[PDB]
Design an enzyme around this catalytic site. Structure first.
Site: not given
Ligand SMILES: Nc1ncnc2c1ncn2[C@@H]1O[C@H](COP(=O)(O)OP(=O)(O)O)[C@@H](O)[C@H]1O
Ligand code: BEF
Ligand SMILES: Nc1ncnc2c1ncn2[C@@H]1O[C@H](COP(=O)(O)OP(=O)(O)O)[C@@H](O)[C@H]1O
Ligand SMILES: Nc1ncnc2c1ncn2[C@@H]1O[C@H](COP(=O)(O)OP(=O)(O)O)[C@@H](O)[C@H]1O
Ligand SMILES: Nc1ncnc2c1ncn2[C@@H]1O[C@H](COP(=O)(O)OP(=O)(O)O)[C@@H](O)[C@H]1O
Ligand code: BEF
Ligand code: BEF
Ligand code: BEF
Ligand code: BEF
Ligand SMILES: [Mg+2]
Ligand SMILES: [Mg+2]
Lengths: 39, 538, 513, 521, 99, 155
Positions: C55, C88-89, C379
């Site tokens: 997160d 947030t990432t 989340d």
């Molecule tokens: N299985 C997957 N394969 C490719 N891209 C993905 C997958 N799951 C999520 N994503 C992309 O990556 C993002 C999620 O990554 P994450 O580490 O949760 O970043 P954040 O915390 O900013 O959401 C999503 O917004 C989506 O566009």
């Molecule tokens: F790593 Be995240 F902000 F879903």
């Protein structure tokens, strides 16, 4: 526009007697020398 | 890249973060395998004060010591979440995480993405949980099997104390749990659990009391020591001088007005005393057999002690704020608060209440009760280091037998369950899915990883661990080709194969249910990390 | 002194570099925490706890940052969480490679900052219209289509293993707080052990209190409930009352007034035919006798915030004044009251009509890893609440971002002049999410960005990267779609960021006050 | 809380892994000193005042000198510094271009490293581009001017090299250089031209002498046969004193008849030494070693000038101008080994009694006000002095259109080799080109012109009269460029060869690393 | 990697003074102005004389510009130009040193 | 027992001594495997004087660095003995004692006497040596093969 600077060497250890207020300190010095001997 | 954001920030990056985590867990398990089973060894501990605690218990070492390694303090939190939810198995979690991280590490150093093994951990954990629901033996506990439950205390106590101390504590633990459980399937442990400790005699002197032995007595010398037919009274409302919550200070202008007030301040208490004696007369007057005893949660004034000693009452002050409830399930009567709404239909009865004095301390007993749902394990013990040690043994058995009741099941011990997993998971990897190949290695580890318990039991045994393992492995295949499968675990005495069903050594379900889901959850989270960071305010 | 002395001034391009340097090296500590193949940066906090998650905002949140440009960057993932929940990432990685792809390539070619800000401000107004036209609106109450949402947004952090249960726990939590919601009427009491398959959203509230008196029932069928905003002992004079005794009798009459005052309360409490009584403040040792005879199991000292939670479930309203306890203020249709015992510690349940508050019971494998699930469920519950407000969904997995790339790569060429260089570098910036998503997967980024950019121009909006494979995938057929407001705000603040830091040309240190 | 360790095998080190200390942290530490000499390139470039480890002031336009006078830590920075020192010893000029290329070669390499390219990919791609740059350079050469040792051609060649170091007077300086070189040329030794700097006057007051200048004290008397001309010279390694032996010389006197005869015989012993030199018709004796007070006394009477003080430096550079041959054995003053000088007088410069040796080896007397600035324009002179020696040795002197024209034609031509290659390597070759935008860009940025309006106007005019077009200074040229063929502005081929080659090695070698390991001080 | 902490490679050695841009140019002029301003009195028929006591107790009185600027220890590297500018005037001419 | 003979003596005993040795050798192979073969990577070394050594050679990193681990200094001496008598293979030795200690530790941790694996090392070494005499290809070097000897420099 302010930088702490080094114009002359060992600037911190250099005092400067200036203008009239210097001449007073010069004449009165000679004056005292005179009072020692005048007698 | 990180070193710019903070000049003085500790960090363990990339593959070092893995290593640091694995070497530490592999290590915690190296300091906590001296404890596994009855073949283990007692350790003496001395804290900075000089206080000698003395236990083989897993959770004990962990709570008694200062933990510095961060990856280590996280593993000791799964051990705590085990002791608080199960009672037993606080060591199984540590070295299960140890050999689980150790075995998973051998493949990552070979060049495998952690996540590949992580999934292989979960897919195995899911399988191990379905296997368990099928491996257990259904003991008909709604039939309360007198001696089968005697063989769950004897299995759990032996792994904490003596050969001859365990044969003493065994009935005392079992008979306790049995003296709590109800047909409506309830067991509010804390009630019939009253672990009482005494400094005198010996730890092999512990007595089961099918009542309640208290920590106080009659504060007046003239009070009765032995009450032959005790009507017990359970009160809480303070029998003491108390000033008014609104400012009390008074004014008087006569040398008499003093005294005629000097009793006017005691009158409230005395009027609360009256209503008690009025019950102590209405119930005892007619029966010279029937006695009258009080166990009060709040205070009993010295003015009011001379009162209770007069009317031959046995008064008891400031008892534990929980003992109200324990006594209700001991004698029968409900705990009354007020004195003004008091009837003789509310008095509890115990066929005997006696006060034993030891030096200057007093112990009020509550014996020969007509029907009790709450009891007491009076732990007697010479020193002070044992009085906690033999308590931390009784706890790890009193919760261990109650797990046989709570769960309508049980699992054959000596680590038969783990061996059977390591054989099953090695075969059905092709079967489970026809899996992603990569996933397959994660299982292949997790599977052979579980073998800790057996090995680290033979290690403690002294016998050759790899040899007695292969021994159980050999005598199992003999039953696997003979169709009818009979359970097989490690005999710790002779260094041979054995049947835990025959040898009478058992091991609770919930223990092994929250052992695997805890270990996998923490080991399959410790792999996945790539950094160990330290940053924060001074 | 002239100024004050002990003041380190960083000026010009010198100061500019420091900001872009830090802001980009901020992205660096989280680059390997993006998407599915992402990791868990285990953190040591100051006073001895431990945090280990993905997160984004929870990683940064536990890092101390000194260089103001990164203090501005980190406190920028905070805005993101406090609006959407997920993403947030992302925000910080973009905030970085907007300042990285854009700035040095063009600030060190003499282009003045204020032109660049106007150039990057237009690139947002454009970027938002692109995201909203490449997204597709969704049915918010197609209970099973919304589970595909949540299934995708948890498919990131350690919780994936049990998505099916989590989505049911997330979706069913937001379903019973909806007129629109607030996910702080949802207590998430974490209870160590068992397994996740034991977690169950209770249409009700769970308490850690035991019944104050032994004799009072631990099981009530259909309890009529009263909630109390006031103590259950006699109150004092708030006017500093003091008593001056003269006569002999006086003592007992007063010392019973307090005994009676409680009976005057209890007579007024019990007068609403209750079986349950819960108070925010503590309960007297004489109050229990008159409420035992009333047949009411009493609960004392319960959190102020837990009362508003209970009163919403049970339907009863909380009243401070005992005097005016009305017929309305009683708990109609709470289906059960029990005090089940979860190994050593007593918990009081309140189960079973029209709910609008809810308690999520969680079970795991530790008190430590439980938190890391709660960080995942928070989340999860977020991505579900976004959508009910903003019904539209972006086609994620790098696809929404690449869409912004070639749409802005066309607009830049059609703009020309000097304003073009900064504008053609937000288009440069967007592709950084695909770039890190190929990386965290482990494929060759250049080889796959190529077969992504061009295979987007005449190959639909929904063409992104599959995490675990590391190949191009049509996200319609796959099932990774991120809610529209994430992609909106992510691009919004991340630019608002780069355009705050560019205005800096001077850093004066040692300011005071 | 508290963190564990990783591994303790060493005594206390630091390791910069993952190419981090190379892919990012190194590029940016190089950028710090890349921006430094970025504003020192060319005539519009600014000098930098550097106070060294001992407080001695040094002001230079040069990159290599300015970098040699700094104390440097960063290892990957040190790499391009030795590379600027490479082209200092091996060409004299181009030291600023070594840096500006390698620095940008890495600066523009940052967009590739982040794109997804490997380290080994960019290395090979930059090698395939460098080897093309040198090949496509050899076919742009103009004016392979080789008019023997022409005095008028030297002036056209040196003017631009001097111009970009001390723009004050490219004309008045290179005339001094060319004229001193004209007095030596009949392999054209760098050492055959010497520089003597003495404070007073202006930069114009400077002169060129067809011999040498000695700031030593003359002895007996000054040769006034100087007006009459044709003076003869003799040189000695030995001291002009009674020849002592290397082994302890003790003088054992036995009889009293020895004392008189020793001391009075000593008189004759060296008078006879001096007479064997006077009777050979010698008018000037240059002593490297010592001279006795008795020996100079007889030489004083024989009417002969004496010039003591020279170390081995002078005895060799004086030998080449007068045409003498120095002998260690004092007993053989041969007529076949004597010298011949046109004038040996005491010309007093700045107040100093200085001996002249005019009319082979020549000496420029650079005069000015600040002993500081005079040091730098000696390095400017030595740039062209060494640029002349670089014309002679290699078979081809050759010429390239400078001021950017050479660089911009390279941007176009290198990209042409870029698009011909397909594969992943294509981008490294294409970026290798964009890095050459620095040479004109810095020339523009130093002049204070619209970088965004000059470069497009410079490329546009370069798409055969296009070959000559390169950037210029001033308000009319604020419009753009100048026909470099007409302003006499060219740099040589051998200058841009060593530069683009050493700069490609320097940027490759820092890209070869991905783990730097350093020890405590 | 060996270290849990790996600081940052330094460009130059600690205690290195660096000055850039407009600050630099204008600072150097002001520094020169200082040396000039104090030498400005000794000019002309009604010129002031200066009494300098050197670091070694050597007391000197003068109007000779080169002598004043030489007995003043100028450290500033840009204001050392004004000492060399006066020194060259004494070498070639003798007078003008102050001017 | 030992602590009575010297109050201030450091000592790693029993199973800890084995663990220290292996962790160290595993560790020294962890810092040198970056050098194995042409696929390896170039490392820049700067000593306290500021001198830039720049080599992928194994015996180079070992000479150029200040080794503190006693078990590690012993392994570096094997690499010396290699380079001084052979010239090549100074990296092969290090990570051959690493993976050799590593693979043997997998059995001692399970519960096997080290002496048991020590004999198994020697009885495999004697075998590995007899196999080598039979695995090599005899090139007629008395004929001096012009281009075959060109492919050994090239290797
Ligand atoms: N299985 C997957 N394969 C490719 N891209 C993905 C997958 N799951 C999520 N994503 C992309 O990556 C993002 C999620 O990554 P994450 O580490 O949760 O970043 P954040 O915390 O900013 O959401 C999503 O917004 C989506 O566009
Ligand atoms: F790593 Be995240 F902000 F879903
Ligand atoms: N007589 C026995 N023979 C073989 N195994 C036994 C015997 N008694 C107990 N065990 C095993 O020992 C283990 C108990 O270990 P113990 O030392 O109590 O630590 P923990 O806290 O992990 O339970 C159980 O796995 C049980 O199967
Ligand atoms: N009169 C001039 N006008 C414009 N550019 C010039 C002129 N003279 C030289 N140059 C350019 O200056 C560059 C040389 O820069 P300089 O400061 O001498 O460093 P270096 O010679 O070490 O590269 C050459 O590339 C040349 O094209
Ligand atoms: N082109 C190649 N392909 C595959 N392996 C190679 C190649 N060249 C060399 N090797 C192998 O790499 C090893 C050479 O290792 P090297 O880095 O020279 O360290 P050292 O020889 O000192 O152990 C040899 O074992 C050889 O078999
Ligand atoms: F050491 Be245990 F929790 F039986
Ligand atoms: F920087 Be140079 F050799 F004019
Ligand atoms: F002050 Be001067 F040298 F005439
Ligand atoms: F690194 Be080796 F000795 F080829
Ligand atoms: Mg030059
Ligand atoms: Mg004058």
């Amino acid at each position: 526009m302010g930088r702490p600077f080094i114009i002359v060497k060992d600037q911190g250890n250099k005092k400067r007697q200036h203008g009239l207020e210097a001449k007073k300190s010069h004449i009165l010095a000679a004056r005292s020398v005179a009072s020692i001997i005048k007698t | 890249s990180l070193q710019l954001l903070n000049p003085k920030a500790e960090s363990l990056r990339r593959d070092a973060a893995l290593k640091v985590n694995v070497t530490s867990a592999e290590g915690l398990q190296s300091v906590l395998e001296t404890n596994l089973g009855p073949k283990g060894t007692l350790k003496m501990l001395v804290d900075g004060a000089g206080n000698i605690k003395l236990t083989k218990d897993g959770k004990v070492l962990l709570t008694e010591m200062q933990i510095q390694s961060p990856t280590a303090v996280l593993i000791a939190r799964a051990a705590a979440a085990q002791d608080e939810i199960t009672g037993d198995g606080t060591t199984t979690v540590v070295c299960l995480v140890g050999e689980l991280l150790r075995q998973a590490h051998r493949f990552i150093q070979e060049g495998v993405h952690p996540r590949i093994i992580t999934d292989g951990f979960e897919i195995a954990r899911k399988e191990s949980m379905k296997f368990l629901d099928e491996f257990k033996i259904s003991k008909t506990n709604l039939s309360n099997d007198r001696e089968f439950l005697l063989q769950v205390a004897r299995s759990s106590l032996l792994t904490k104390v003596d050969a001859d101390l365990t044969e003493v504590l065994t009935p005392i633990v079992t008979d306790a749990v049995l003296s709590v459980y109800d047909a409506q399937a309830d067991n509010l442990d804390l009630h019939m659990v009253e672990i009482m400790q005494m400094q005198h005699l010996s730890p092999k002197d512990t007595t089961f009391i099918k009542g309640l032995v208290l920590d106080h007595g009659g504060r007046h010398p003239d009070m009765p020591t032995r009450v032959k037919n005790a009507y017990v009274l359970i009160l809480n409302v303070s029998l003491e001088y108390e000033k008014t919550e609104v400012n009390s200070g008074f004014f008087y202008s006569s040398a008499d007005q003093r005294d005629k007030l000097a009793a006017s301040e005691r009158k409230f208490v005395d009027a609360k005393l009256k209503k008690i004696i009025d019950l102590k007369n209405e119930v005892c007057g007619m029966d010279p057999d029937k006695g009258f005893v009080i166990i009060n949660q709040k205070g009993i004034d010295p003015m009011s002690l001379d009162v209770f000693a007069k009317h031959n009452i046995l008064a008891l002050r400031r008892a534990k704020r929980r003992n109200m409830e324990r006594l209700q399930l001991v004698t029968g009567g409900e705990a009354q608060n007020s004195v003004e709404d008091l009837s003789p239909q509310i008095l509890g009865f115990s066929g005997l209440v006696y006060q034993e004095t030891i030096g200057e301390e007093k112990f009020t007993y509550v014996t020969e009760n007509t029907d009790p749902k709450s009891c007491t394990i009076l732990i007697k013990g010479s020193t002070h280091y044992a009085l906690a040690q033999t308590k931390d043994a009784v706890r790890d058995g009193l919760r261990a037998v109650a797990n046989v009741l709570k769960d309508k099941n049980i699992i054959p011990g000596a680590g038969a369950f783990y061996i059977a997993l390591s054989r099953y998971l090695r075969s059905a990897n092709m079967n489970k899915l026809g899996a992603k190949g990569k996933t397959k290695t994660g299982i292949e580890a997790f599977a052979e990883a579980l073998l800790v318990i057996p090995k680290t039991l033979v290690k403690n045994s002294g016998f050759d661990p790899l040899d007695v393992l292969a021994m159980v492995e050999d005598e199992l295949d003999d039953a696997q080709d003979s169709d009818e499968t009979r359970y097989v675990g490690v005999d710790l005495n002779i260094g041979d194969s054995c049947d835990p069903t025959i040898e009478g050594i058992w091991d609770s379900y919930r223990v092994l249910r929250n052992a695997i889901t805890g270990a996998t959850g923490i080991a399959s989270n410790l792999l996945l990390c790539d950094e160990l960071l330290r940053a924060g305010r001074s | 002194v002239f100024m004050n002395a002990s003041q380190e001034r960083t000026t010009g391009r010198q100061a500019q570099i420091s900001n872009i340097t830090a802001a980009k090296a901020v992205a660096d500590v989280i680059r390997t925490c993006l998407g599915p193949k992402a990791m868990l940066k285990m953190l040591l906090d100051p006073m001895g706890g431990l945090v280990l998650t993905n997160d984004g905002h929870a990683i940064l949140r536990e890092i101390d940052v000194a260089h103001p440009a990164a203090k501005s960057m980190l406190e920028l993932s905070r805005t993101q969480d406090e609006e959407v929940g997920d993403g947030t990432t992302t925000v910080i990685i973009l905030a970085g490679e907007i300042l990285a792809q854009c700035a040095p390539y063009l600030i060190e070619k003499n282009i003045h900052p204020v032109i660049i800000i106007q150039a990057l401000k237009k690139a947002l107004t454009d970027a938002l219209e692109v995201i909203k036209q490449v997204s597709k609106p969704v049915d918010v109450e197609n209970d099973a289509a919304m589970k595909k949402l949540i299934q995708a947004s948890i498919g990131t952090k350690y919780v994936i293993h049990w998505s099916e249960k989590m989505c049911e726990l997330a979706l069913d939590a937001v379903k019973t707080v909806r007129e629109i919601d607030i996910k702080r009427y949802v207590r998430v009491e974490k209870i160590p052990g068992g397994d996740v398959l034991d977690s169950r959203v209770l249409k009700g509230v769970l308490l850690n209190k035991d019944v104050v008196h032994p004799k009072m029932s631990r099981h009530i069928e259909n309890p009529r409930v009263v909630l109390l905003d006031c103590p259950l002992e006699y109150k004092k004079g708030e006017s500093q009352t003091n008593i001056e005794i003269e006569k002999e009798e006086d003592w007992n009459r007063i010392l019973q007034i307090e005994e009676e005052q409680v009976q005057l309360m209890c007579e007024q409490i019990l007068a609403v035919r209750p079986t349950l009584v819960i108070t925010e403040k503590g309960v007297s040792d004489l109050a229990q006798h008159y409420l035992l005879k009333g047949g009411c199991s009493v609960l004392r000292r319960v959190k102020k915030s837990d009362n508003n939670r209970i009163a919403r479930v049970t339907g009863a309203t909380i009243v401070n004044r005992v005097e005016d306890l009305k017929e309305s203020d009683v708990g109609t249709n709470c289906g059960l009251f029990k005090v089940e015992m979860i190994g050593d510690e007593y918990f009081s349940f309140l189960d079973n009509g029209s709910g609008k508050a809810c308690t999520i019971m969680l079970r795991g494998g530790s008190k430590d890893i439980l938190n890391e699930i709660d960080r995942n469920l928070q989340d999860a519950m977020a991505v579900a609440r976004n959508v009910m407000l903003s019904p539209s969904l972006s086609p994620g997995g790098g696809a929404t971002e690449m869409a912004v790339s070639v749409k802005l790569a066309e607009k830049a060429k059609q703009l020309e002049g000097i304003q073009q260089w900064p504008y053609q570098a937000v288009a440069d910036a967007m592709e950084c999410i695909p770039r890190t998503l190929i990386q965290n997967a482990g494929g060759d980024p250049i080889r796959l960005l190529s077969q992504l950019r061009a295979k987007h121009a005449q190959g639909n909006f929904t063409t992104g990267i599959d995490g675990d494979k590391g190949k191009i995938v049509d996200m319609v057929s796959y099932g990774i779609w991120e809610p529209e407001v994430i992609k909106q705000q992510s691009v919004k603040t991340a630019i608002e960021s780069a355009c705050l830091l560019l205005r800096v040309d001077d850093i004066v240190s040692g300011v005071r006050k | 809380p508290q963190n564990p360790n990783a591994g303790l095998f060493k005594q206390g080190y630091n390791s910069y892994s993952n190419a981090d200390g190379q892919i990012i942290k190194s590029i940016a530490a190089i950028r710090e000193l890349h921006q430094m000499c970025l504003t020192s390139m060319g005539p519009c470039g600014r000098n930098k005042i550097i106070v060294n480890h001992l407080g001695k002031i040094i002001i230079t336009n040069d990159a290599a000198t300015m970098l040699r006078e700094l104390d440097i830590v960063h290892p990957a920075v040190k790499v391009l510094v030795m590379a600027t020192e490479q082209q200092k010893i091996d060409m004299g000029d181009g030291t600023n271009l070594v840096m500006i290329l390698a620095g940008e070669l890495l600066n523009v390499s940052e967009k590739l490293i982040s794109m997804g390219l490997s380290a080994v990919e960019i290395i090979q791609g930059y090698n395939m581009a460098r080897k093309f740059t040198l090949k496509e350079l050899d076919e742009m050469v103009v004016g392979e001017i080789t008019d023997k040792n022409d005095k008028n051609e030297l002036l056209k060649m040196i003017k631009p090299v001097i111009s970009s170091k001390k723009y004050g007077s490219e004309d008045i300086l290179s005339e001094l250089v060319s004229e001193a070189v004209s007095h030596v040329l009949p392999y054209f030794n760098v050492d055959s031209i010497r520089v003597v700097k003495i404070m007073g006057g202006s930069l114009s007051n400077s002169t060129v002498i067809k011999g040498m200048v000695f700031n030593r004290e003359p002895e007996g008397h000054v040769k006034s046969l100087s007006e009459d001309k044709k003076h003869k010279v003799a040189v000695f390694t030995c001291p002009l004193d009674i020849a002592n032996t290397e082994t302890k010389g003790t003088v054992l006197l036995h009889n009293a008849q020895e004392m008189l005869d020793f001391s009075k015989g000593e008189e004759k012993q060296i008078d006879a030494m001096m007479k064997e030199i006077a009777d050979m018709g010698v008018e000037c004796i240059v002593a490297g070693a010592g001279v006795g007070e008795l020996a100079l006394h007889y030489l004083n009477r024989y009417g002969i000038l004496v010039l003591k003080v020279p170390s081995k430096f002078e005895l060799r550079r004086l030998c080449r101008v007068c045409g003498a041959t120095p002998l260690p054995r004092l007993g053989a003053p041969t007529p076949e080994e004597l010298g011949l000088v046109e004038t040996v007088k005491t010309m007093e410069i700045g107040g100093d009694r200085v001996t002249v040796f005019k009319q082979r080896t020549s000496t420029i007397i650079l005069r000015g006000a600040t002993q500081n600035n005079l040091d730098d324009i000696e390095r400017a002179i030595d740039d062209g002095v060494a640029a002349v020696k670089g014309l002679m040795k290699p078979s081809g002197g050759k010429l390239l259109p400078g001021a950017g024209a050479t660089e911009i034609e390279l941007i176009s031509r290198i990209t042409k080799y870029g698009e011909r290659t397909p594969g992943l390597l294509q981008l490294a070759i294409k970026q290798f080109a964009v890095a050459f935008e620095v040479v004109p860009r810095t020339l523009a940025e130093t002049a204070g012109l619209d970088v965004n309006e000059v470069l497009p106007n410079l490329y546009a005019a370069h798409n055969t009269d296009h070959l000559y077009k390169g950037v210029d200074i001033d308000g009319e040229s604020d419009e753009g460029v100048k026909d470099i063929r007409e302003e006499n502005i060219y740099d040589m081929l051998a200058t841009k060869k060593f530069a683009i080659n050493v700069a490609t090695e320097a940027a490759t070698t820092v890209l070869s690393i991905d783990q730097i390991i350093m020890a405590k001080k | 990697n060996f270290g849990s902490q790996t600081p940052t490679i330094v460009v130059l050695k600690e205690g290195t003074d660096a000055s850039q841009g407009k600050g630099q140019i204008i600072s150097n002029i002001n520094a020169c102005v200082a040396v000039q301003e104090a030498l400005k009195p000794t000019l002309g028929p009604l010129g002031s004389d200066i009494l300098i006591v050197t670091s070694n107790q050597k007391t000197t009185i003068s109007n000779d510009g080169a002598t004043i600027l030489k007995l003043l220890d100028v450290v500033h590297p840009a204001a050392k130009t004004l000492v060399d500018i006066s020194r060259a005037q004494d070498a070639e001419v003798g007078d003008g040193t102050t001017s």
